[PDB]
């Protein structure tokens, strides 16, 4: 099933590693032009070696002033993945002021800033397009000491669907993701332990984690003119632990 | 992205019209080998003209017995698309026992009695599969005259959970689609009025209904490798209508 | 605060046990009176022993052709509290025709029929009124072995939805109760089982199954004008279960 | 139905007008005593004139330090209403940072850090409690202009659950009411245009926005031991908006 993402301009958010990575390596593949936007220089400088010719941009997008000088002038994008994210992980009754500002900075206010960028230059192009907003599983279903990171998500489907409504008359699609625990730094720093994993793991009933591959692919669907009459979604990538 | 489905067995119900038959389209061109299962000889006889090589199975699935002995002997079916639906509309008050038991006996009950059959032969094979049953926009939301078929619906994508729950150890994954109105025989039989489709239109953020090529993307989606991590999912096909 | 439920006619289906024989004991109390409907005679008996003046109906409402002949001349109803249902329980691969038709048959097509007969009263009377429906966790959450059952309260959420849509207008909420497991007959039949019934409480928040009083003054509130803006909603009395 | 309000230390948020007065105003009249916050000191002098013993607290609940020191020595607290919010309507490709960071630590973060105070009294002294949080329509479905407004409801919602699975084991349970279009201040400051509100109306199966009266009691009913075995949940008070 051709996609007809080949020569088509794509920024990935959170670019670095993880889900963003492996994004950005599949579409260098397909043969897409991509902006690779993340915090940590090193990781971008790798990158570039694995995927000659991506566009790094190297910014912290909690920094909304930050965020638009960085993102300026980034010229034609045509897609776009939100993917950047942190898991500030506490005990409700431990919250703090500090750790609620930054995970709603990253998590939410920059997925508005990033796609208001993107959208205004496809509007004043006259051209459709699509993006994507890496959610999770944890966006309709609460874990113990994610009570932020849960709202920032639950935040999320909620504004991929007024984005979705708002943007349909420019024919902008917007989806989410959501993704069951993927073992990367992300997902491998609490669920490491293989008793905590293993609560998790039995209430998934095809017994198992998702790899980046699996998120990889639901993007790029979701990308593609393939998902044509899906728009203010939120797909689940969780072996079905939603469903039981 | 290719999807792997070239030369595998599929069985695809409710092929002689509108999604079906796009679907036993799509598969024959990508190179699978296609159990048409339809309730109307010639539906099948012209089809098989269309796509020779696609092994035509006439029958009612609204009867048990009857289905029981057609899908007998069907052979190995790796993947299953569950499409063969009536919408029988009558107001709340008008609802018949008549309509209300073929409703329940094709619309879910063979869903369940085929997808056993497929099923049971997986299983007894050892080899992992895929089905696609396909619901509607209405089993989440509900539209006048059609509280049966809102009702199957919503009765559907709960099945596609329990399946989803108990085939997950077998590596059989079970989703929904959920288009809204499609302009076949069964969508512009009651949506044909400008006006009654004109309120829904305006709840539709892209603007349109869904074409059969819509739905056919996501059911080969649904029923790829490409999607090994969504399983019990209820995937809109209905342009944004369910977020606003 | 005061229900006003004194003085008015209601009718509970599955009267005879559990929460049903609750519902009938909790309005008698209040001063309503009731038409207490239950397929088993002994169980009516003792009920009107135990609340005198209530109004007994001995019938299967699995068979709608009985139904309609014994709630015939029923007489006024402003109040419904669709209750009886029947949990036939077959893993997924063993599911059969007679046990899917007899779970559709009362668990659905019954809320309909005894809805219809109550609503056309109202409808004829030109006066506001009230249906819940006992729905169920599982409405919305899979459980192995209950395909069929957990299809049954799916669907049944979603027929409380078209009812609302329809009868609104006609000033009559639909809504419906979700509670967990309740340790009556049917709930003790297989989460008897300590540690069946242990994983299940290791994901109720509050750490225990519903008492009979929980999932009555939810019906009783839902029934009053207290709740006078509520309707096609599922009210879930399961702990927090839907929540994590 | 006696709730066992009277004599319990109930504190409002948002109490200077529309819901958060309702609230205080049938609080204060079945016997409670109450803790009135809010943001302007008149509307909070009259309330105190209108409800003799209520104690008054204005503080701006979107400045974190103002609110730790302002609701430093409450008191006991058994019962929390979290209503203070604010509507800043933008559309998407309008939004601003400033609306962005007062919707969330307003609608959000003031719940957060309010219900933390009350939590952790109520444990401290090794008592049971409730906790209701006003959420919307909205945070489930999209209204356009309302990208961050539909995110902090959507948000809220999830808390909620996050906040029901974490203070279960402490007996707090903690709800939310969702609300369609009340005519208060917010409410007829953008649906008071006669078809602006006419669009929405028409998906209202009750034919009416709601009444303050409508929310109080679902907060009433959810605060009281009347629903002791529902936590986590999103209670709708939108006359079937969500049904349909
Ligand atoms: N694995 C899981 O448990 C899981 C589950 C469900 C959903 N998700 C979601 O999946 C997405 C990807 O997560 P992942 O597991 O791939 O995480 P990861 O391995 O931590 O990757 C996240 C990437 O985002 C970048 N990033 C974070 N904050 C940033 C900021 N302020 N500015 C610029 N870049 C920033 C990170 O950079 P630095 O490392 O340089 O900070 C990193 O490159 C997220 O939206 C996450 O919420 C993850
Ligand atoms: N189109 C829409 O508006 C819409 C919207 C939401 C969801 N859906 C769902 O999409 C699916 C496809 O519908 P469609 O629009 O493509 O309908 P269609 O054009 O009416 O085609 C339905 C096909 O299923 C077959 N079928 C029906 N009952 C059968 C039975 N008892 N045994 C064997 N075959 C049977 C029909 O055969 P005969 O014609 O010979 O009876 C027909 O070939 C259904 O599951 C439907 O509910 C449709
Ligand atoms: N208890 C749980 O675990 C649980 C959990 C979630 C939801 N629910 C729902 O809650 C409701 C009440 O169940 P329960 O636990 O109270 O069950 P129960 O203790 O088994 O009582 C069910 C009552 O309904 C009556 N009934 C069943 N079929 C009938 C028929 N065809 N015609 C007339 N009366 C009939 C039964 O009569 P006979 O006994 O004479 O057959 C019995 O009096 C149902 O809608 C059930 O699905 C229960
Ligand atoms: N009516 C609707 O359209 C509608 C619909 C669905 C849900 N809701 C929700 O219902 C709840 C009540 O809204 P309403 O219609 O009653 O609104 P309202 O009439 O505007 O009342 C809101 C109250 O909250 C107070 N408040 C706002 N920000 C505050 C802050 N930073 N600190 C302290 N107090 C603050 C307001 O004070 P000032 O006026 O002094 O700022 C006002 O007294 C909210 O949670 C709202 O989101 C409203």
Not at 21 to 29: D, I, K, W, Y
Not at 162 to 168: D, H, Q, R, S, T
Not at 222 to 237: A, E, I, K, Y
Request: with cysteine; aromatic share 4%; glycine share 10%.
């Amino acid at each position: 099933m051709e996609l007809f993402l080949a020569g088509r301009r794509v920024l990935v958010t959170g670019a670095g590693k993880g889900i963003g990575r492996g994004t950005v390596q599949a579409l260098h593949a397909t043969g897409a032009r991509v902006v690779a936007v993340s915090r940590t220089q090193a990781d971008l400088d790798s990158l570039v070696r694995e995927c000659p010719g991506i566009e790094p941009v190297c910014v912290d997008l909690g920094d909304w002033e930050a965020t638009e000088r960085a993102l300026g002038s980034v010229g034609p994008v045509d897609l776009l993945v939100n993917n950047a994210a942190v898991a500030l992980l506490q005990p409700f009754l431990e919250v703090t002021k500090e750790a609620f500002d930054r995970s709603f900075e990253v998590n939410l206010r920059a997925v508005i800033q990033v796609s208001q960028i993107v959208a205004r230059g496809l509007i004043a192009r006259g051209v459709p397009g699509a993006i994507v907003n890496v959610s999770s599983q944890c966006s309709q279903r609460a874990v113990t000491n994610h009570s932020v990171y849960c709202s920032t998500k639950g935040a999320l489907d909620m504004l991929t669907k007024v984005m979705a409504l708002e943007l349909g008359p420019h024919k902008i699609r917007v989806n989410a993701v959501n993704p069951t625990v993927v073992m990367t730094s992300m997902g491998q720093a609490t669920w490491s332990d293989p008793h905590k994993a293993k609560t998790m793991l039995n209430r998934i009933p095809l017994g198992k984690f998702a790899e980046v591959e699996h998120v990889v692919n639901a993007i790029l669907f979701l990308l593609s003119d393939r998902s044509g009459m899906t728009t203010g979604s939120t797909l689940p990538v969780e072996g079905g632990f939603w469903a039981c």
